[PDB]
Design an enzyme around this catalytic site. Structure first.
Site: not given
Lengths: 388, 391
Positions: A87, A164-165, A320, A342
């Site tokens: 709610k 890879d995402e 980054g 990454g």
């Protein structure tokens, strides 16, 4: 039962009253006192004129803590989120910041299967931070392309390579083929180089096919299952983590969670979502935006705070990040962290192999408190020269 | 494939640059023949429109931003045709990119083929009730917590005799096995049907952990459940879809918005409510969609997505909720037409003549509104005492 901590921007300027209305409104509205919600604490906070301006109304800020009896909800995340924020999620300027589970309630959740210690034993890397990287440009490319990138990252010294995402089931690199081919590549690199790399493969598809696909993946030899928890639901992650027929670690990816946590006025806080709830649900790793922010450190805090009910999860600050930031990462997160290179690792002048060596060398230097610029290594040097 | 529309507050004041940036980073990234097949996976910017600047926002964010609407198309070949992949593709990384909000998703005809849409829809619901003209009336049990079965039956009978078309469980429930409320409720409702010739449906809340939902839903059906009330956003749209796609669950599904606010409460972030409570819920298979009533522009947008013509999916019943009493019936029909559910909430029990009198008030109010005759000039005591207490 459970204590929900809310951050509210009260336009009525009466934190006490509002707190009590929520406590009653979300519970009973003699034998009823047994389900009555209790206001545990009210904390006045500093006023923000910029927010008053944005909302075109004066609002009183504060933190409210309410205790909901265990008898009021089934012990699972969908019921807990519904009870504590179903709610309120549509009632205005109110954000769920934390949930404090009683020791009794925690007994209903699995926590990570492996945790930090299980992962380290699995990889046989006992002290240093782990290193992970990601495939770059997989879409539209074939299995041979994947195998070559995987081989280079492993030879480079990476401990975990993840899909890879946005890689979904497709005709070129379908699940079982990626797994089977990848397993063979990493075994070969191990046999010759003596370094074992794990492959975290994307587990996607329909919610009700996830267990079947997860087991097909395990059967094919998958190392780690990469899962976009928030595209499916915490309760789904939990069921996967609870299955002993899925004996592999699960790496949670934060995709879509921003829809819940981006706002400072509404939603659910990032630390609760990516930190506490992911851990309780069973994620062995949690990827989250890096501070390269107290936000990031908070997530990490919940992933690793001592708790007799659950194993600790590996923190994986992401995006980054380059070799130069390794010192900052270890100071900020400690040694039990995963350095996420990454997909940028492939950008190193000497390919993924050079990028991985740069990170590995950087990690070891850091652990010896030795400056990075004073390190004699062509790979690490060119890294600091191109990235900073 | 699929086109995503975003509302962005760019702090780089270059919508055209940020757009192209997004269309690339979220898709692709060599010999001619290979380049040719790879171009098939690239994102394409479909539209970029600038919007009026908002100073209050600039002040709030402590930075100046350029407001705009960006539309990026993603090739189907880039994702499996399911909501999880779709949301991950269009708003996975972007959800953490800053001030960006998913406003809409336009599915292609071929993509739509992979989704069910409502099993029953408006026409299916009307056929079940044998009510083919006026808007429907729904009420909610009130003060059910800590009560017995005999109490439930009595309140159920009163709501039915009052002319309510659908009775549903309230939001907060903690003694009354589903199969029991279902069986006993069915008994009560058949009694009223064979006595007054009026059909009332009981929407029961479907609960349990995700992987027990289908088995639980089928058991509810086996027990005689009329409608399954489901808190979609506590589980996920893909779960609702699997329920809707299951032929062994031959009953309508009523979606409740609980938790959805965690996604759409912000004007700068998240996913818009109309996209969630309207389009996606319909595509995923919700026969009814409950959403906050404008008693504003989002309420209509939602209704629009639920009812807008589409050859791929049946239409869903709009169910504006909160702050509704007999007096508003004329408004609701005005804003939502006749194919809408009048949600009396638990407000009927407040009527001076109980639920039976509260239901009659609504039923009289709707018949009058369809006759265009003002409610003030209606010689009906139940309706009069309603307009006299609620306004």
């Amino acid at each position: 039962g459970i204590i929900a901590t809310y951050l509210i921007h009260d336009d009525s300027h009466n934190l006490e009253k509002k707190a009590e209305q929520i406590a009653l409104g979300l519970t009973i509205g003699e034998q009823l006192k047994q389900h009555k919600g209790n206001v545990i604490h009210v904390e006045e906070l500093a006023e923000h004129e910029h927010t008053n301006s944005y909302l075109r109304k004066k609002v009183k800020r504060g933190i409210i803590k309410i205790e909901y009896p265990l008898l009021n909800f089934s012990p699972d995340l969908p019921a807990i989120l519904t009870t504590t924020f179903g709610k309120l999620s549509l009632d205005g300027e109110v954000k769920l910041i934390d949930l404090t589970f009683s020791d009794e309630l925690k007994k209903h959740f699995p926590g990570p299967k492996f945790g930090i210690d299980g992962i380290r034993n699995l990889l046989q890397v006992h002290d240093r931070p782990l290193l992970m990287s990601i495939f770059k440009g997989m879409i539209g490319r074939n299995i041979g392309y994947l195998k070559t990138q995987l081989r280079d990252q492993a030879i480079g010294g990476v401990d975990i390579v993840k899909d890879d995402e946005i890689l979904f089931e497709n005709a070129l690199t379908p699940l079982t083929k990626r797994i089977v081919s990848g397993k063979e590549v990493l075994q070969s690199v191990y046999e010759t180089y003596g370094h074992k790399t794990l492959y975290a493969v994307n587990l996607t598809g329909r919610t009700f096919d996830l267990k079947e696909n997860a087991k097909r993946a395990v059967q094919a030899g998958a190392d780690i299952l990469l899962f976009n928890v928030f595209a499916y639901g915490l309760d789904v992650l939990q069921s996967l983590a609870e299955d002993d027929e899925i004996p592999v670690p699960i790496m949670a990816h934060p995709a879509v969670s921003g829809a819940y946590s981006a706002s400072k006025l509404y939603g659910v806080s990032s630390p609760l979502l990516l930190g506490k709830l992911l851990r309780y649900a069973g994620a062995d790793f949690s990827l989250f935006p890096s501070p390269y922010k107290e936000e990031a450190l908070a997530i990490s805090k919940y992933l690793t705070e001592d708790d007799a009910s659950f194993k600790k999860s590996f923190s994986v600050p992401s995006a980054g990040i380059h070799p130069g930031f390794v010192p900052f990462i270890v100071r900020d997160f400690g040694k039990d962290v995963v350095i996420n290179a990454g997909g940028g690792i492939h950008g190193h002048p000497n390919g993924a192999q050079g990028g991985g060596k740069a990170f590995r060398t950087a990690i070891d230097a850091t652990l010896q408190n030795k400056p990075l610029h004073e390190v004699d290594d062509i790979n690490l040097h060119s890294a600091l020269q191109i990235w900073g």
